[PDB]
Each structure stands twice: as C-alpha cells, then as structure tokens.
C-alpha cells in the first residue's frame, strides 16, 4: 500500500460513493461530459450512509450543477465502505469536479 500517495486511490472510492448514487438517479451522461463542472457536497453522518446537509455549487455548465443538486436533495443515503470516526470526517466533505480528458 506504500502510504505516501495512496490517498489518490482512496479518493477514487470516497467521492465515487456519492457520484455513483447521483448519476443513478439521472442516467443522462452526454450533457454531463464534454463540458466541465465543480460542486461540493457536505454530508452529515447516519447509520446507512451519509445524508445531504449542504450543497455548494462552485462552477459548471448549468445542465449538470442543477441536475446533481436535485438528485443529492432526494437520495436515500451514501454508503461508505469504512466505519472509523477519523475517515467518516473525510468522505462527508467532497468536491465533485469533472472535465474532458
């Protein structure tokens, strides 16, 4: 695991538990790609997964930040693979940030 850099592989899970629950409400994709967007989820803890406490839009092409926001306001809960009060405090405050590559 090496422990010097591997947080870059954990962020590929930690923020994915949110983004994968969002896009599974609105399976659109084609108007979410090709442009860019950056928004920010701040969740509260709960026994089935985190819950929407606040959503900050920072920028994007409006067709994504308006759509995600409505999904995050209606999701059941975001299931995290961990359970430690150290890392429960990291996954609760993500930025969903997307662009071409």
CSV table of N, CA and C in Angstrom, one decimal:
chain,number,residue,atom,x,y,z
A,1,UNK,N,0.8,-1.2,0.0
A,1,UNK,CA,0.0,0.0,0.0
A,1,UNK,C,0.8,1.3,0.0
A,2,UNK,N,2.1,1.3,0.5
A,2,UNK,CA,3.1,2.2,0.4
A,2,UNK,C,3.0,3.5,1.3
A,3,UNK,N,1.7,4.0,1.3
A,3,UNK,CA,1.2,5.0,2.3
A,3,UNK,C,1.7,6.5,2.1
A,4,UNK,N,2.4,6.7,1.0
A,4,UNK,CA,3.0,8.0,0.7
A,4,UNK,C,2.1,8.8,-0.3
A,5,UNK,N,1.2,8.2,-1.0
A,5,UNK,CA,0.4,8.7,-2.1
A,5,UNK,C,-1.0,8.1,-2.3
A,6,UNK,N,-1.2,6.9,-1.8
A,6,UNK,CA,-2.4,6.0,-2.0
A,6,UNK,C,-3.7,6.7,-1.7
A,7,UNK,N,-3.8,7.8,-1.0
A,7,UNK,CA,-5.0,8.7,-0.9
A,7,UNK,C,-5.6,9.0,-2.2
A,8,UNK,N,-4.8,9.1,-3.3
A,8,UNK,CA,-5.2,9.3,-4.7
A,8,UNK,C,-6.0,8.1,-5.2
A,9,UNK,N,-5.8,6.9,-4.7
A,9,UNK,CA,-6.7,5.7,-5.0
A,9,UNK,C,-7.9,5.6,-4.1
A,10,UNK,N,-7.8,6.1,-2.8
A,10,UNK,CA,-8.9,6.2,-1.9
A,10,UNK,C,-9.9,7.2,-2.4
A,11,UNK,N,-9.4,8.4,-2.9
A,11,UNK,CA,-10.4,9.4,-3.4
A,11,UNK,C,-11.2,9.0,-4.6
A,12,UNK,N,-10.7,8.0,-5.3
A,12,UNK,CA,-11.4,7.3,-6.4
A,12,UNK,C,-12.5,6.3,-5.9
A,13,UNK,N,-12.5,6.0,-4.5
A,13,UNK,CA,-13.7,5.4,-3.9
A,13,UNK,C,-14.5,6.4,-3.1
A,14,UNK,N,-13.9,7.1,-2.2
A,14,UNK,CA,-14.5,8.0,-1.2
A,14,UNK,C,-15.5,9.0,-1.8
A,15,UNK,N,-15.2,9.7,-2.9
A,15,UNK,CA,-16.0,10.5,-3.7
A,15,UNK,C,-16.9,9.8,-4.8
A,16,UNK,N,-16.6,8.6,-5.1
A,16,UNK,CA,-17.3,7.8,-6.0
A,16,UNK,C,-18.6,7.3,-5.4
A,17,UNK,N,-18.7,7.0,-4.1
A,17,UNK,CA,-19.9,6.5,-3.4
A,17,UNK,C,-21.0,7.6,-3.5
A,18,UNK,N,-20.7,8.8,-3.7
A,18,UNK,CA,-21.6,9.9,-3.9
A,18,UNK,C,-22.0,10.0,-5.3
A,19,UNK,N,-21.0,10.2,-6.2
A,19,UNK,CA,-21.2,10.5,-7.7
A,19,UNK,C,-22.0,9.3,-8.4
A,20,UNK,N,-21.7,8.1,-8.0
A,20,UNK,CA,-22.4,6.9,-8.5
A,20,UNK,C,-23.8,6.8,-8.0
A,21,UNK,N,-24.2,7.3,-6.8
A,21,UNK,CA,-25.5,7.3,-6.3
A,21,UNK,C,-26.3,8.5,-7.0
A,22,UNK,N,-25.6,9.6,-7.4
A,22,UNK,CA,-26.2,10.7,-8.0
A,22,UNK,C,-26.6,10.3,-9.5
A,23,UNK,N,-25.6,9.9,-10.2
A,23,UNK,CA,-25.8,9.6,-11.7
A,23,UNK,C,-26.8,8.4,-11.9
A,24,UNK,N,-27.0,7.6,-10.9
A,24,UNK,CA,-28.0,6.5,-10.9
A,24,UNK,C,-29.5,7.0,-10.7
A,25,UNK,N,-29.7,8.3,-10.3
A,25,UNK,CA,-31.0,8.9,-10.4
A,25,UNK,C,-31.3,9.4,-11.8
A,26,UNK,N,-30.2,10.0,-12.4
A,26,UNK,CA,-30.3,10.7,-13.7
A,26,UNK,C,-29.2,10.2,-14.6
A,27,UNK,N,-29.5,9.1,-15.4
A,27,UNK,CA,-28.5,8.4,-16.2
A,27,UNK,C,-28.2,9.1,-17.5
A,28,UNK,N,-28.0,10.4,-17.5
A,28,UNK,CA,-28.0,11.3,-18.7
A,28,UNK,C,-26.6,11.2,-19.4
A,29,UNK,N,-25.6,11.5,-18.8
A,29,UNK,CA,-24.1,11.4,-19.1
A,29,UNK,C,-23.7,12.3,-20.3
A,30,UNK,N,-24.4,12.3,-21.4
A,30,UNK,CA,-23.9,13.0,-22.6
A,30,UNK,C,-23.9,14.6,-22.5
A,31,UNK,N,-24.8,15.1,-21.7
A,31,UNK,CA,-24.8,16.5,-21.3
A,31,UNK,C,-24.1,16.8,-19.9
A,32,UNK,N,-23.5,15.8,-19.3
A,32,UNK,CA,-22.7,15.9,-18.1
A,32,UNK,C,-21.2,15.9,-18.5
A,33,UNK,N,-20.8,15.2,-19.6
A,33,UNK,CA,-19.5,15.2,-20.2
A,33,UNK,C,-19.3,16.3,-21.3
A,34,UNK,N,-18.1,16.4,-21.8
A,34,UNK,CA,-17.7,17.3,-22.9
A,34,UNK,C,-17.5,18.8,-22.5
A,35,UNK,N,-18.3,19.2,-21.5
A,35,UNK,CA,-18.1,20.5,-20.7
A,35,UNK,C,-17.4,20.2,-19.4
A,36,UNK,N,-17.3,21.1,-18.4
A,36,UNK,CA,-16.8,20.9,-17.1
A,36,UNK,C,-17.8,21.4,-16.0
A,37,UNK,N,-17.6,20.9,-14.8
A,37,UNK,CA,-18.4,21.3,-13.6
A,37,UNK,C,-17.6,21.0,-12.4
A,38,UNK,N,-17.8,21.9,-11.3
A,38,UNK,CA,-17.3,21.7,-10.0
A,38,UNK,C,-18.3,22.1,-8.9
A,39,UNK,N,-18.7,21.2,-8.1
A,39,UNK,CA,-19.7,21.4,-7.0
A,39,UNK,C,-19.2,20.6,-5.8
A,40,UNK,N,-19.8,20.8,-4.6
A,40,UNK,CA,-19.3,20.4,-3.3
A,40,UNK,C,-20.4,19.9,-2.4
A,41,UNK,N,-20.3,18.7,-1.9
A,41,UNK,CA,-21.3,18.1,-1.0
A,41,UNK,C,-20.7,18.0,0.4
A,42,UNK,N,-21.5,18.5,1.3
A,42,UNK,CA,-21.2,18.5,2.8
A,42,UNK,C,-22.3,17.6,3.4
A,43,UNK,N,-22.0,16.4,3.8
A,43,UNK,CA,-23.0,15.5,4.4
A,43,UNK,C,-22.9,15.4,5.9
A,44,UNK,N,-23.9,14.9,6.6
A,44,UNK,CA,-24.0,14.5,8.0
A,44,UNK,C,-23.9,13.0,8.1
A,45,UNK,N,-23.4,12.5,9.2
A,45,UNK,CA,-23.3,11.0,9.5
A,45,UNK,C,-24.7,10.4,9.8
A,46,UNK,N,-24.9,9.2,9.4
A,46,UNK,CA,-26.1,8.4,9.6
A,46,UNK,C,-25.8,6.9,9.3
A,47,UNK,N,-26.5,6.0,10.0
A,47,UNK,CA,-26.1,4.5,10.1
A,47,UNK,C,-26.1,3.7,8.8
A,48,UNK,N,-26.9,4.2,7.8
A,48,UNK,CA,-27.0,3.5,6.5
A,48,UNK,C,-26.1,4.2,5.4
A,49,UNK,N,-25.4,5.3,5.8
A,49,UNK,CA,-24.6,6.2,4.9
A,49,UNK,C,-24.8,7.6,5.2
A,50,UNK,N,-24.0,8.5,4.7
A,50,UNK,CA,-24.1,10.0,5.0
A,50,UNK,C,-25.4,10.6,4.3
A,51,UNK,N,-25.8,11.7,4.8
A,51,UNK,CA,-27.0,12.4,4.3
A,51,UNK,C,-26.7,13.9,4.0
A,52,UNK,N,-27.4,14.4,2.9
A,52,UNK,CA,-27.2,15.8,2.5
A,52,UNK,C,-27.5,16.8,3.6
A,53,UNK,N,-26.5,17.5,4.1
A,53,UNK,CA,-26.6,18.6,5.0
A,53,UNK,C,-26.5,19.9,4.2
A,54,UNK,N,-25.6,20.0,3.2
A,54,UNK,CA,-25.5,21.3,2.4
A,54,UNK,C,-24.8,20.9,1.1
A,55,UNK,N,-25.2,21.6,0.0
A,55,UNK,CA,-24.6,21.5,-1.3
A,55,UNK,C,-24.1,22.9,-1.8
A,56,UNK,N,-22.9,23.1,-2.1
A,56,UNK,CA,-22.3,24.3,-2.7
A,56,UNK,C,-22.0,24.0,-4.2
A,57,UNK,N,-22.6,24.9,-5.0
A,57,UNK,CA,-22.2,24.9,-6.4
A,57,UNK,C,-21.0,26.0,-6.6
A,58,UNK,N,-19.9,25.6,-7.2
A,58,UNK,CA,-18.7,26.5,-7.3
A,58,UNK,C,-18.6,27.0,-8.8
A,59,UNK,N,-18.9,26.1,-9.8
A,59,UNK,CA,-19.0,26.4,-11.2
A,59,UNK,C,-19.5,25.2,-12.0
A,60,UNK,N,-19.8,25.5,-13.3
A,60,UNK,CA,-20.1,24.5,-14.3
A,60,UNK,C,-21.1,24.9,-15.4
A,61,UNK,N,-21.3,24.1,-16.4
A,61,UNK,CA,-22.3,24.2,-17.4
A,61,UNK,C,-23.6,23.7,-16.7
A,62,UNK,N,-24.6,24.6,-16.6
A,62,UNK,CA,-25.7,24.6,-15.7
A,62,UNK,C,-26.6,23.3,-15.7
A,63,UNK,N,-26.6,22.6,-16.9
A,63,UNK,CA,-27.3,21.3,-17.1
A,63,UNK,C,-26.8,20.2,-16.1
A,64,UNK,N,-25.5,20.3,-15.6
A,64,UNK,CA,-25.1,19.3,-14.5
A,64,UNK,C,-25.3,19.9,-13.1
A,65,UNK,N,-24.8,21.0,-12.7
A,65,UNK,CA,-25.0,21.5,-11.3
A,65,UNK,C,-26.4,21.6,-10.8
A,66,UNK,N,-27.4,22.0,-11.7
A,66,UNK,CA,-28.8,22.0,-11.4
A,66,UNK,C,-29.4,20.5,-11.3
A,67,UNK,N,-28.9,19.6,-12.1
A,67,UNK,CA,-29.4,18.2,-12.1
A,67,UNK,C,-28.9,17.4,-10.9
A,68,UNK,N,-27.6,17.4,-10.6
A,68,UNK,CA,-26.9,16.7,-9.5
A,68,UNK,C,-27.6,17.2,-8.2
A,69,UNK,N,-27.7,18.5,-8.0
A,69,UNK,CA,-28.2,19.2,-6.8
A,69,UNK,C,-29.6,18.6,-6.4
A,70,UNK,N,-30.5,18.5,-7.4
A,70,UNK,CA,-31.8,17.9,-7.2
A,70,UNK,C,-31.8,16.4,-6.8
A,71,UNK,N,-30.9,15.6,-7.4
A,71,UNK,CA,-30.6,14.2,-7.0
A,71,UNK,C,-30.1,14.1,-5.6
A,72,UNK,N,-29.1,14.9,-5.2
A,72,UNK,CA,-28.5,14.9,-3.9
A,72,UNK,C,-29.5,15.3,-2.8
A,73,UNK,N,-30.5,16.1,-3.2
A,73,UNK,CA,-31.6,16.5,-2.3
A,73,UNK,C,-32.7,15.4,-2.1
A,74,UNK,N,-32.6,14.3,-2.8
A,74,UNK,CA,-33.6,13.3,-2.8
A,74,UNK,C,-33.0,11.8,-2.7
A,75,UNK,N,-31.7,11.7,-2.8
A,75,UNK,CA,-31.0,10.4,-2.4
A,75,UNK,C,-31.3,9.8,-1.1
A,76,UNK,N,-31.3,8.5,-0.9
A,76,UNK,CA,-31.6,7.8,0.3
A,76,UNK,C,-30.5,8.0,1.4
A,77,UNK,N,-29.2,7.8,1.0
A,77,UNK,CA,-28.0,7.8,1.9
A,77,UNK,C,-26.8,7.3,1.1
A,78,UNK,N,-25.6,7.8,1.3
A,78,UNK,CA,-24.4,7.4,0.6
A,78,UNK,C,-23.6,6.4,1.4
A,79,UNK,N,-23.6,5.1,0.9
A,79,UNK,CA,-22.9,4.0,1.7
A,79,UNK,C,-21.4,4.1,1.5
A,80,UNK,N,-20.7,4.4,2.7
A,80,UNK,CA,-19.3,4.3,2.8
A,80,UNK,C,-18.8,2.9,3.2
A,81,UNK,N,-17.6,2.5,2.6
A,81,UNK,CA,-17.1,1.1,3.0
A,81,UNK,C,-16.4,1.1,4.3
A,82,UNK,N,-16.0,2.2,4.9
A,82,UNK,CA,-15.3,2.4,6.2
A,82,UNK,C,-16.4,2.6,7.3
A,83,UNK,N,-15.9,2.8,8.5
A,83,UNK,CA,-16.7,3.0,9.8
A,83,UNK,C,-15.9,3.7,10.9
A,84,UNK,N,-14.8,4.3,10.6
A,84,UNK,CA,-13.9,4.9,11.7
A,84,UNK,C,-14.2,6.4,11.7
A,85,UNK,N,-14.5,7.0,12.9
A,85,UNK,CA,-14.7,8.4,13.2
A,85,UNK,C,-13.5,9.3,12.7
A,86,UNK,N,-12.4,8.7,12.2
A,86,UNK,CA,-11.3,9.5,11.6
A,86,UNK,C,-11.6,9.8,10.1
A,87,UNK,N,-12.1,8.8,9.4
A,87,UNK,CA,-12.3,8.8,7.9
A,87,UNK,C,-13.8,9.1,7.5
A,88,UNK,N,-14.7,8.8,8.4
A,88,UNK,CA,-16.1,9.3,8.3
A,88,UNK,C,-16.1,10.9,8.1
A,89,UNK,N,-15.1,11.6,8.7
A,89,UNK,CA,-15.0,13.0,8.6
A,89,UNK,C,-14.3,13.5,7.3
A,90,UNK,N,-13.8,12.6,6.5
A,90,UNK,CA,-13.1,13.0,5.2
A,90,UNK,C,-14.1,12.9,4.0
A,91,UNK,N,-14.8,11.8,3.9
A,91,UNK,CA,-15.7,11.4,2.8
A,91,UNK,C,-17.0,12.3,2.9
A,92,UNK,N,-17.4,12.9,4.0
A,92,UNK,CA,-18.5,13.8,4.2
A,92,UNK,C,-18.4,15.1,3.5
A,93,UNK,N,-17.2,15.5,3.1
A,93,UNK,CA,-16.9,16.8,2.5
A,93,UNK,C,-16.1,16.7,1.3
A,94,UNK,N,-16.7,16.3,0.2
A,94,UNK,CA,-16.2,16.1,-1.2
A,94,UNK,C,-16.4,17.3,-2.1
A,95,UNK,N,-15.6,17.4,-3.1
A,95,UNK,CA,-15.9,18.2,-4.3
A,95,UNK,C,-16.1,17.2,-5.5
A,96,UNK,N,-17.3,17.2,-6.1
A,96,UNK,CA,-17.5,16.6,-7.4
A,96,UNK,C,-17.0,17.5,-8.5
A,97,UNK,N,-15.9,17.2,-9.2
A,97,UNK,CA,-15.3,18.1,-10.2
A,97,UNK,C,-15.0,17.3,-11.4
A,98,UNK,N,-15.4,17.7,-12.6
A,98,UNK,CA,-15.4,17.0,-13.8
A,98,UNK,C,-15.0,17.9,-15.0
A,99,UNK,N,-14.4,17.3,-16.0
A,99,UNK,CA,-13.8,18.0,-17.2
A,99,UNK,C,-13.4,16.9,-18.3
A,100,UNK,N,-13.2,17.4,-19.6
A,100,UNK,CA,-12.7,16.5,-20.6
A,100,UNK,C,-11.2,16.0,-20.3
A,101,UNK,N,-10.9,14.9,-20.9
A,101,UNK,CA,-9.5,14.2,-20.7
A,101,UNK,C,-9.3,13.2,-21.8
